[PDB]
Symmetry: T
Subunit: 151 residues, 12 copies
Amino acid sequence: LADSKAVLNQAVADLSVAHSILHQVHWYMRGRGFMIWHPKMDEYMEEIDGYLDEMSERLITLGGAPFSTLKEFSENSQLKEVLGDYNVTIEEQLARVVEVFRYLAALFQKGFDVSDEEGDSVTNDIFNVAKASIEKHIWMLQAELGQAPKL
Amino acid sequence: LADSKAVLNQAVADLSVAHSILHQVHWYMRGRGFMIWHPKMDEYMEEIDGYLDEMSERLITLGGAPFSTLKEFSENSQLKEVLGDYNVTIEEQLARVVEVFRYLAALFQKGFDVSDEEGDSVTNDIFNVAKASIEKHIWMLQAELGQAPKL
Amino acid sequence: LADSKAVLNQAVADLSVAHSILHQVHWYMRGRGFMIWHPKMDEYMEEIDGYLDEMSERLITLGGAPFSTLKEFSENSQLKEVLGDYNVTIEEQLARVVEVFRYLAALFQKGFDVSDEEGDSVTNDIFNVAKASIEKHIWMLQAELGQAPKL
Amino acid sequence: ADSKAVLNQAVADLSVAHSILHQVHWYMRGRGFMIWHPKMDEYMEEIDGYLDEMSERLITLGGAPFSTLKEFSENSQLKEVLGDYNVTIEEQLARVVEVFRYLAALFQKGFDVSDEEGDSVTNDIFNVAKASIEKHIWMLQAELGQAPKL
Amino acid sequence: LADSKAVLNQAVADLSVAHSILHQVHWYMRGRGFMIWHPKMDEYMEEIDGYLDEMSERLITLGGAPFSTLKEFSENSQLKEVLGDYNVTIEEQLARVVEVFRYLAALFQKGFDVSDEEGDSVTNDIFNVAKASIEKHIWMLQAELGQAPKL
Amino acid sequence: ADSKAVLNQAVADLSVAHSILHQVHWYMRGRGFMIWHPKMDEYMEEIDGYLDEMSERLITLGGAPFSTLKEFSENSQLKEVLGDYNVTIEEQLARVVEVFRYLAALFQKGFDVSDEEGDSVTNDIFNVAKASIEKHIWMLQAELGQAPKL
Amino acid sequence: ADSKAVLNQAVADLSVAHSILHQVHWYMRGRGFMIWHPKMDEYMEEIDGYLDEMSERLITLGGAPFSTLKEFSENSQLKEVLGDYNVTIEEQLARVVEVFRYLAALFQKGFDVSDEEGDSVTNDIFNVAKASIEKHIWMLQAELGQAPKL
Amino acid sequence: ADSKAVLNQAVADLSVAHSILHQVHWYMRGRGFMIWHPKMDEYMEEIDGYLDEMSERLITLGGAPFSTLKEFSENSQLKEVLGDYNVTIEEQLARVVEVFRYLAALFQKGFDVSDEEGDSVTNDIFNVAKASIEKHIWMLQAELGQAPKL
Amino acid sequence: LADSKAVLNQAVADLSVAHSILHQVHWYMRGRGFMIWHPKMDEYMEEIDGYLDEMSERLITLGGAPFSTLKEFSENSQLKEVLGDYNVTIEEQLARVVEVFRYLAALFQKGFDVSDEEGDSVTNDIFNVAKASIEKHIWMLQAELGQAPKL
Amino acid sequence: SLADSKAVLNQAVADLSVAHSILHQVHWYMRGRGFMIWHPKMDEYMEEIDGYLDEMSERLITLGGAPFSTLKEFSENSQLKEVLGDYNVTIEEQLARVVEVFRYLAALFQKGFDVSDEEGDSVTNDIFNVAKASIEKHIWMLQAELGQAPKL
Amino acid sequence: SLADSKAVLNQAVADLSVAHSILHQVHWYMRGRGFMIWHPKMDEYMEEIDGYLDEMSERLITLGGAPFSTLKEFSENSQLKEVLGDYNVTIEEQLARVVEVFRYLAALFQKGFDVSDEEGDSVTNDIFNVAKASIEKHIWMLQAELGQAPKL
Amino acid sequence: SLADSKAVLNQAVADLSVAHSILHQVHWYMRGRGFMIWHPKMDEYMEEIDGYLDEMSERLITLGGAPFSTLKEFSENSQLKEVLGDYNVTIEEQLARVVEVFRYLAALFQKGFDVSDEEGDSVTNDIFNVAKASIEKHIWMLQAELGQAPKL
Ligand SMILES: [Ca+2]
Ligand SMILES: [Ca+2]
Ligand SMILES: [Ca+2]
Ligand SMILES: [Ca+2]
Ligand SMILES: [Ca+2]
Ligand SMILES: [Ca+2]
Ligand SMILES: [Ca+2]
Ligand SMILES: [Ca+2]
Ligand SMILES: [Cl-]
Ligand SMILES: [Cl-]
Ligand SMILES: [Cl-]
Ligand SMILES: [Co+2]
Ligand SMILES: [Co+2]
Ligand SMILES: [Co+2]
Ligand SMILES: [Co+2]
Ligand SMILES: [Co+2]
Ligand SMILES: [Co+2]
Ligand SMILES: [Co+2]
Ligand SMILES: [Co+2]
Ligand SMILES: [Co+2]
Ligand SMILES: [Co+2]
Ligand SMILES: [Co+2]
Ligand SMILES: [Co+2]
C-alpha cells in the first residue's frame, strides 16, 4: 500500500469487515459475561464506524475513490470472516476481537508511516488517534482475559 | 369484552407477584455478577411496573375493577413465592427470573389471543408490545447462562 | 442490633402494603381534583419505594434477611387493605392516605428511638429523613382537606 | 380507497376538535381553571400530532388532504358554537369528553376500514390514537365523578 | 415459524446491503443539494441500522442464526451494488435510494404477511413499524424529485 | 376597543394563515422540499404563538375571541384555495411571502391603533410579531432571488 | 414624581407583595391547595425578578433603592395583616388579585412617567412587568369564576 | 425557648439577613465587585431555602410563622442600616460574616433546644443549615486573609 | 426610513470596531482580576456580535446595504483603535471598555430617536433592548472601578 | 486519633489519601474476568473518597485546623499500608483488599462520629455518619460479589 | 525564540479576521436558491474561524508575541482582498468565493505546520494541523455542492 | 524498544501525583483577596492534572509497564518538593508556586515528547503534546494575573 490514499482505502475495507465481525460477536455471544460484553460490542462498532467514515472522507478529500460495496470490502480486506456460531465461548469471542484490533492497530501504524513519508500530516493524525484508542481497548480486553496487552 | 378484561386482571396479579420476586432476587443475590445483575433487576422491576400500570388502567378504561390488594394478587396469581435465601447461586437466581419471564410471555400470548378474539385491538397491542420485550429479555438472560432462548 | 433490624423489617412490610394502598387510591379515584391527585399518588409511590429499598438494603447490610414475599408483607404489616371502590370520594381517599402516612411517621419514630438506643446512627438517620418528608406530606394533604397537620 | 376516505374525514374532524379545544382553553372559568386550562394545550398538541400523521399517511397513499377551513368545516361531523364564558367547568369538560367519544368512534371506523383493505400501516395509526383518546376519556370521566363508559 | 425466520434473515441481508448503498450515496454525492442530502443519508443509515439490529435479534430470540458475514449479506440479498461514481446527478442518487426503499417496503410487506400467517405477532409489528417509516421516506424523496409517491 | 378589534382580526387571520402554511407543507413538491417542508413547521409554531398570545390579550382586555372555523374564515382577509401538488416550490414560497406581507401589514395596523388608544402591552405584542415576520420575508425573498421589498 | 421615584416605589411595593404572597403560600388551606400553594412560588419568583430589575435600573440611573424592611414597609402603599389559616382558598386568591391590580396600576404610572421623561429603558421594564401581571389577573379571576375586570 | 419558638425566630432573622444581603448586592463598589456581586445572589438563594424549610417545619409542627415585614423586623436580633455605596468590599464582606456568625449561633440554639425537646427533624434542619453557613464563614474570612475563628 | 438605515449602518461599523477593541482588551490584559475579566470580555464580545448581527439584518430587511469590509467599518466608525499594549493596567483597560460602552449607549439613543420619529418601531425596539444592557454593563464596570455609573 | 474532632478529621485526611492511592493501584493492576465492570467501578469509589477527603479537610480548616497536605504527612500518619503494584493478584483478591480498606474507613468514621458526638460538634458528626453509611453499603455490595455476607 | 512560528500565527490572526469579514458579507448579501441552507452554514463557518483566531492568537501571546488587534493591522497584514457587498452575486459564485478563502487558509495552515515543525514548536504544529484538517473537509463539501472534485 | 518512553511516563505518574498534592495544599491554605476565584480554580487544575495522570499511567500499562502506585513511590521518584502547609503565604506567592509546578510539568512534557519521538512512540508523543499545550496556556493566564509575561 505505497501511498496515503491506498492505505486509507485499505482501512475502509478492513474497518467494514471489522464492523461485520464485531456484529457477529454481539449476536452469537453466549456465556457468563454476555450482559457486559454484548453492549460493549455496540460501543466498539460505533467507534469503528467513526474511523470508517473519517478515513473514507479523508480519501474523498484527497481526490480518491473509497471502496463502497460489500464486494470491494471482502475482496480488499485482510480479515477473514467465518459463519456465526453460538458455541464459541466468551473467551474465544473476546480473543477474536483482540486479533482484529491488533490487525487494525498494525494497519494504522502502516497508515501513520506512509502518510508521514508523504508529508500528509492530516491523514497522519487520523491514523494516530485511531491507533491510540484501539491500543487502549487491547489493554482492557486483554486484562479481562487475564493477560498483559502484549502489543 | 369480559375475557379481555379477565386476562388484564390476571396480568395485574401476576405482574404484582413477578415484581415481588424480582425484588427478592435483587436483594438476596450473591456471587460473581452481583454488580451487573443487581441493578439490572431494578431495570426489569421498572418495566414490570410499566406493564402493571398500563394493563390495570386499560382495565379501568374498559369499565373493570383491577385487583388492588396483596391478598387479591397472591390468591389470583399463578406465580408461587418462596422465602428469601442468600445461598442461592447467581446462575439459579437468573434461571428463576427466566421462569417468571417465560410465564409472563405465555400469559401475554393468552392476553393477545383473547383480545384478538374480542376485537379489542388496543389491549391486543399492549400484550404484544410487552411480549416483544420480555422475549428479548429471555434471549439475553439465557445467553448469560450459556443457553439458547428456547421460547 | 436486633431491634434496629426488627423495625427495619417492619418498615419493609408496612411500606409494601402502603405502596399497594396508594396504587388502589391512584386507580379507584374519581371526583373533582382527580387530575392533580391521581399523578400525585405516583409521586408518593415513588418516595415510598425509595424508602422501601433503602430500609431493606440497610437491613441486608446489617446482616438481616428482609421480608420478600407478598405473604410476609401482608402478615407482618399493621396496615389493613380493603377491596377497591370507585364510590369513595376524593376527600375520603386523601384521608386514607393521611392515615397511612400518620402510621408511617409513627413507625419511623419508633425506628428512630430504637436505633438511637442501639447506637445504629446510620439507621437512625434513615428514619429521621423519611419522617421529615412524610410529615411534610401530612401537612400538605391536611391543608388540602382544610385542616391543621395535627401531628 | 376507503381508508383514504376515513383518513381525510379524520383530518376534517381533528381540525374542528382542535378549534373546540382552543375555545374551551380560552372561555374556561371556574374552579379547576389552573389545571384544566393548560391541559387543553396538552390535548391540542396530541390532536395536532394525529392530524399531521394522518394527512401525511393520506399523501403517502396518493391522496389529497383537506387543507382549507371550508373543507374542514363542511366535511366534519362535529359542530362548533360561539364562545361563552358562562359555561361551567364541568360542562366544558363534558363537551371535551363528547368530542373525544366521537374521535374514538371515528378511529375505530378507521381501524376497521384499513383492516379490511389490509392497509396495516394506517391500521396501526388509528389503533395508537384510539388507545390514547380512550385513556383520556377515562380520566376526564373520572374528574367528572363518572365511569369511562366506552 | 420457519418462514418468519427466513424473512427476518432476508431483511438482515438486504438491510446490510441497503446500508452499504446509502453509504456510497453519502460519499459519492456531488451537485446542488449536497449539503442537505449528504447528512440526510446518515439519518437513513441510522434508521436502517436500527431495523437490522431489531430484526436480526428477533431471529436470534426465535432460535435462528442470522447472516453475519459480508459474503452471506451479498449473496442472499436481492439488492445489487455498482461501483462508486462521482458523476451521477443528485436527482439520480435520490431515485436510486427510492428504488432501494421501494424494495425494502415490499420486502417488509412480505414479512408482515408471512408472520401474520404463522401467528408471530411480534415480528409482524416489527415489519409494520419499519414499513410505515420507509413509506413516509418514499413520499418525501419523491416530493423532492417532483413526483407523487406512487406506492 | 379598536385594539380589541384588531386583536380579534389577527386571531382570524392567524388561524387562516396557519391553515395555508399547513397546505403548503403538505402539497409541496420539487427541489428544496427537504428544507422548506420542515421550515413550514417552524412558521406554523410561530403563528400559533401569536394566535394564542393575541387571543389571550383580547380575553385579558375583557373581549371575546373568535373561536370557531366559521368566525375565522368569515372575518379573515386571506383567501384559501384548494390544495394543489403541481404548484412549484418557488410559487409556494411566493404564496407564503404574500400571507406574511399581509400579516406584517395587519400587525402594523395593530401597532398603530394600540399606540393611539394607550395600550402599550398590546402595542409590544404587535411590534414583536411584526419584527419577526419581516425577518422571515427577507429570508424567503432572498431564497427567491429578490429584495425584501417591504 | 420621576423615573427614579417610581422605580424606588416599585422596590418597596414588590418587597411587600413578596411578603404577602409568602403569607398566602404558608397559611393556605382548602380544596386547591396542592395547585395554588406552588403557584405562589412562581409568583414570588416573578416578583423577585421585577424587584431585582427595577432596583438595578434605579442604581444604573444614579439612584439609591430602599434596602431595609423599615423602608419597604413605610414607603409601600400595600398593607400587611397577620397570617390566618381560617382564610379560604377563594379569599386568598382574591387578595393576590388585589395585590396584582395594585402592582399593574403602579406599573402604568411608571410607564407614563418614564415615557414623558424619554427614559425608554425604564418604560420597557414597566411595560413587560405589566403585561405579565395582567395575564395573571385574567387567570386568577377565571379560577374565581369572574372576568378579569382590568 | 422551644423548637417552635426558635424556628419562628429563625424565620424573623433569615428574612432580615436576606434584606441585608440584598443591600450588599446592590450597594457594592470596588475591586472584586464582579465576583462578590453575584456571590450575594447565591447566598440569598441559600438563605431563602432555610427560610422556606424552617417556616414549613413550624407550620408542620402546628405553629404560625411570622409573615409580615413588621413581625420580621421586630423579632429579629439583626439590625438594618441605610444603603450606602461608599462602604469598602472588605467592609461589605465583614458585614456579611457577622450576619453569618449570628445565624450559625442561632442555628446552634435551635439545634440545642430541638435536641432537648427530642424533635429530631428540626434538629437536622438546624444542623444542615449550620454546616453550610460555617463553610461560608471560612471562605469569606479567607478572602479577608483571616482564619474562620468560629 | 433613510435615517433609520443610516444609524443601523453606523452601528454595524461601530460594533465591528468595538468587537475588535474588546478582543484587544481580552488578549493584552495583565494584572490582578485577569482571571475574571479576561473571560468577561468574551461575554461582552458575544453580546456585541448579537447586536451586530441583528442590526445589520434589520438593515438588509429594510432595503439597505450593510458595511461588510474592514475598510468600511474602520473609515465609518467614530471609535479609534490603538496598538495592543501589555503595559496598560487592568483599571485602565476597564476604563476603556467603559468609554466604548458610553459611545455605543449614546449611539443607541440616537438610533432610538431617529427610528421613533421615522415610524420604524422594529428598529426602535432593537436599539432600546441593546441600550438597556450596555447601561447595566456601565453600572457594573463602574462599580468595579469604585465609581457611580454616571450615565 | 484520638484527642478530638480536629485530630480524627486529620487522621481521615491522611487515611483517605492512602485509600485513594490503593484504589488507583487496584484500578491499574486489575486483571481477570470482571475487569470491565470493576475497573470503572474503582473510578466511582475514588470519586467518592475524594469527596470525603475534601469535605473532611475543609471541615478541619473551618474548625481552625491545619490539614495534612504533603505525601509524607499522609503516608506517615495513615494506618493503611501500601505494597508494590502486582498484575498477578486475582480480581477476587483485589476486591477483598478494597473491602479491607473500606472496613478500616468505616471503623475510622465510627470513631470520628463518637469523638465529635462527645464534644458536641454535630456538623462533624453528620459528616462521619453520612460517609460511614455509604461505605457500609459498598461493603455489602463488594462482599455480595464475593459470595459473602457483609459481616460488619 | 520560534520567530517564524510566531510570525505565521500573527499572519493567521490577520487572515482569520479578514476571512471572518468575508464570510459575514457572503452571509448577509446572499440571494438565490439554497439561501436557507447556506446562510446559516456561514454562521457555523464563522464560529469555526473565530475559534481558530482565538486559539492562534492566544498561542502567540503564550509564546511572548504580540497579536494584531486593530482592523488596520488586520487589513494591512492580510493577503486576502475584500470587495464591496453585492446582492447580485449568485449562490454558486458566493460558495466559490468561500472555497477560494478556504484554499488560502489551508495553504496558510500548511505553511504554519511546516514552519513550526522546523522550529520544534509541536504545540503550534498541532493547532495548524487540526485547523487544516477541518478547512480541507469543508472544501471537499463546498466543492461537492458545486459539482466539483475538491482539487486540494 | 520503548524503555525510555515507559520511564518518562512513570516519571510523569510520580510528578503528577505530587503536583496534585501541591495544588491541594494551595487550594486548602489559600488566604487573601482573590480567594473566591482562585480556590475553585485549583479544583479545575487538580481535575486536569488527574486526567493526565490517568491517561499517562494507562498508556504505561498499555506498553507493558508497571506504573508507580504508592505514595512512597511517588515521593521518591518525583523531582518536585513539598513543604508543610502555611496559611500566611500570600495569594501571589501561591499563584507563583503553581506556576513553578506548571513550568516543571511543561518541561517534563517536552522531555516526554522528545523521548517518545526518538523511540517512534507516536501515541505517547501526542499525549505529552496535548498536555503541554494546555499547561502552557495556564502559565500564560497565571502570569497575566501576576502582571507578567508568560516567559516560557
Ligand atoms: Ca457455550
Ligand atoms: Ca485467560
Ligand atoms: Ca363519586
Ligand atoms: Ca456532476
Ligand atoms: Ca417629571
Ligand atoms: Ca502593568
Ligand atoms: Ca494471589
Ligand atoms: Ca454462595
Ligand atoms: Cl455464585
Ligand atoms: Cl428592499
Ligand atoms: Cl463617582
Ligand atoms: Co459521513
Ligand atoms: Co398510573
Ligand atoms: Co435496590
Ligand atoms: Co408534517
Ligand atoms: Co444489538
Ligand atoms: Co393558551
Ligand atoms: Co441582582
Ligand atoms: Co414553600
Ligand atoms: Co446572521
Ligand atoms: Co475543596
Ligand atoms: Co480568548
Ligand atoms: Co483510569
